[PDB]
Design a protein around this ligand. Structure first.
Ligand SMILES: Nc1ncnc2c1ncn2[C@@H]1O[C@H](COP(=O)(O)OP(=O)(O)OP(=O)(O)O)[C@@H](O)[C@H]1O
Ligand SMILES: Nc1ncnc2c1ncn2[C@@H]1O[C@H](COP(=O)(O)OP(=O)(O)OP(=O)(O)O)[C@@H](O)[C@H]1O
Ligand SMILES: [Mg+2]
Ligand SMILES: [Zn+2]
Lengths: 48, 235, 226
RNA sequence: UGAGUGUUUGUACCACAUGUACAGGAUAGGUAGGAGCCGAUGAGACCGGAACGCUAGUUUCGGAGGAGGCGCUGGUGGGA
């Protein structure tokens, strides 16, 4: 089951990115180091 | 206790889907469901250990007495008395209070306001949990389940499964709670010990939620039965 | 069942009728039939439930006219703080070493007041004072850097007010010997301090019932507005 | 669109009764006052009945009798 997901910056809680993932292949919340435009630096974003 | 639009999904397998429940006060609720239904998970939500993915779970401000389904032995060398004593926050507050006194000597006129406020609450809180409990607990074992004092000085990890269940149940009572969340309170008890637990829960005036796979045990106590469905993911 | 004196006092009193403040103090002075200088105490039943941490109240209020009884002071102080205690005239001046003798000795001192630095050493004795309740409490102001204010307040008649678990907080306003006006003034001071002490989380009417009574006399309901 | 009866109730007054763990003299509900209090307006102690009861005892009514007991104090307990 592949679903659209939102990656939110952990630092400022800003829903910066939209992506998608297969729940079965990745049961746990995804986490990626992405650039947060609000904070203007690379931060850890975790699916919401 | 109330929950609305409850949602919870560990990975791909979901537990609650738009589940709801309202429990009135002073209700001896018997929680029933197959293994994995999510009975233990409900308590974790009540204890705020878990958070619903979506929805609101509402709990009263009253103090909650929680009896875990599995015994929590932080260290192997912990003694039964240490384990039981940890039920009450007397020791924890005293350690904080002792440190507050240390800061008072070090700090003259800087942090006194914060320290003085913290000290006052600890004393008031300590008195609220009257420090006479040291004697009450010693006799709570006797009147509760005929727990011998030789066990009182023995490491908890060395006790038998039935003995551990008695200690854990006594620990819950030692905390003097307002709401009872019992997760299989008679898992290992023998016939004689189960008798005491039943009588106390019948007499217990407050609200008590019981997760049990013992039908006869529940029937003697339960007035309201909450069923956690495994297929509909509802309550 | 009831003594004739108490029955006579009862016929003077009217349970249904909640007297004004002046009426209540006068009626208490009348009701204390027994021939000794009995104390006058007022009981407030606050709506708050002390079982809640915030709700419970514990403080100390200075009474301008005093309690009608002198109060022995024990001061735990060292060096300059001991000098402050000497100036104030503490009934006992001691230090971390004098606490050991104080344990079992010089008991019945009305209130203990220890310096912050001293509290760390004083706490050991305080655990003994704990059950006695004598241990200084910062919320009441007993624990203080300077003891001069504490000692003068004790002499002035500082009263420690602590709500009971059931929500009824009692406090002696003054002796029957005091003039009814001074008792009423002390009662008014008690009323104001309770209002200021009303916790934020409290809702509804703050006080369920106010009663005044002497050590011997019966209880007399008193109007809160008065 | 109003009267009553009765039953069943949820609530608030008002009376009543209960408070027995360890130790402690022993049946210790909390808080505050409390050295003095109470009894020919019939005390102590005795006896029966009734109640409660943890089985220890306690609550209370009564028969007689007529003047006493109780508390502080003392130890215990966290608490008298
Ligand atoms: N962190 C987790 N990761 C993956 N699955 C989980 C996690 N936590 C719980 N689950 C699942 O939640 C499901 C139900 O939760 P819960 O443990 O409360 O069931 P239960 O009814 O209390 O079990 P039992 O009655 O046998 O004691 C479990 O079967 C478990 O598989
Ligand atoms: N490793 C151990 N070290 C010290 N004492 C132990 C040890 N194991 C058991 N004991 C003691 O042996 C006694 C009985 O042993 P056992 O484990 O067989 O109890 P049991 O018969 O299984 O009781 P139940 O299963 O109902 O809890 C217990 O008092 C237990 O505390
Ligand atoms: Mg479970
Ligand atoms: Zn960000």
């Amino acid at each position: 089951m592949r679903v659209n997901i939102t990656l939110e910056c952990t630092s400022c809680k800003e829903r910066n990115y939209l992506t998608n993932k297969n729940k079965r292949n990745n049961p746990d919340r995804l986490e990626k180091q992405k650039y947060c435009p609000r904070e203007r630096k690379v931060t850890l974003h975790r699916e919401t | 206790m109330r929950g609305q639009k409850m949602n919870l999904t560990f990975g791909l397998e979901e537990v609650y889907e738009d589940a709801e429940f309202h429990l009135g006060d002073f209700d001896k609720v018997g929680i029933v469901g197959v293994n994995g239904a999510g009975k233990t998970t409900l308590f974790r939500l009540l204890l705020r250990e878990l958070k619903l993915d979506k929805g609101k779970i509402t709990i009263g401000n009253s103090r909650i007495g929680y009896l875990p389904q599995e015994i929590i032995i932080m260290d192997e060398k912990m003694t039964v008395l240490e384990f039981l004593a940890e039920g009450r926050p007397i020791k924890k507050m005293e350690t904080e209070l002792n440190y507050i006194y240390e800061k008072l000597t070090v700090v003259d006129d800087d942090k006194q306001d914060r320290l003085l406020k913290r000290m006052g609450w600890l004393q008031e809180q300590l008195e609220y949990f009257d420090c006479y409990e040291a004697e009450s607990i010693l006799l709570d074992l006797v009147d509760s389940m005929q727990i011998d004092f030789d066990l009182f000085d023995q490491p908890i990890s060395e006790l038998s499964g039935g003995q551990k269940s008695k200690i854990s149940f006594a620990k819950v009572l030692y905390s003097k709670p307002e709401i009872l969340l019992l997760d299989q309170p008679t898992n290992h008890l023998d016939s004689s010990t189960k008798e005491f637990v039943t009588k106390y829960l019948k007499s217990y005036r407050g609200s008590v939620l019981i997760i049990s796979h013992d039908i006869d045990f529940l029937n003697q106590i339960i007035d309201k039965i909450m069923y956690i469905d495994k297929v509909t993911h509802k309550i | 069942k009831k003594s004739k004196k108490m029955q006579e006092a009862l016929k003077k009193v009217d349970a249904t009728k909640a007297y004004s403040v002046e009426e209540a103090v006068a009626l208490a002075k009348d009701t204390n039939i027994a021939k000794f200088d009995a104390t006058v105490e007022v009981a407030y039943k606050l709506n708050v439930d002390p079982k809640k941490a915030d709700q419970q109240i514990r403080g100390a209020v200075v009474l301008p006219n005093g309690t009608g009884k002198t109060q022995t002071v024990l001061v735990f102080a060292k060096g300059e703080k001991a000098k402050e205690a000497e100036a104030a005239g503490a009934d006992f001046v001691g230090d971390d070493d004098m606490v050991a003798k104080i344990q079992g000795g010089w008991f019945d001192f009305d209130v203990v007041v220890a310096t912050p630095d001293m509290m760390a050493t004083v706490g050991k004795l305080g655990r003994v004072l704990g059950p006695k309740g004598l241990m200084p409490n910062p919320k009441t102001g007993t624990v203080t850097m300077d003891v001069t204010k504490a000692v003068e307040e004790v002499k002035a008649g500082k009263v420690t007010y602590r709500v009971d678990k059931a929500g009824n907080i009692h406090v002696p306003i003054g002796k029957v010997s005091f003039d009814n006006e001074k008792l009423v003034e002390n009662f008014n001071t008690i009323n104001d301090v309770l209002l200021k002490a009303k916790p934020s989380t409290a809702k509804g009417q703050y006080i369920k019932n106010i009663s005044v009574t002497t050590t011997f006399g019966p209880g007399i309901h008193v109007d809160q507005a008065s």
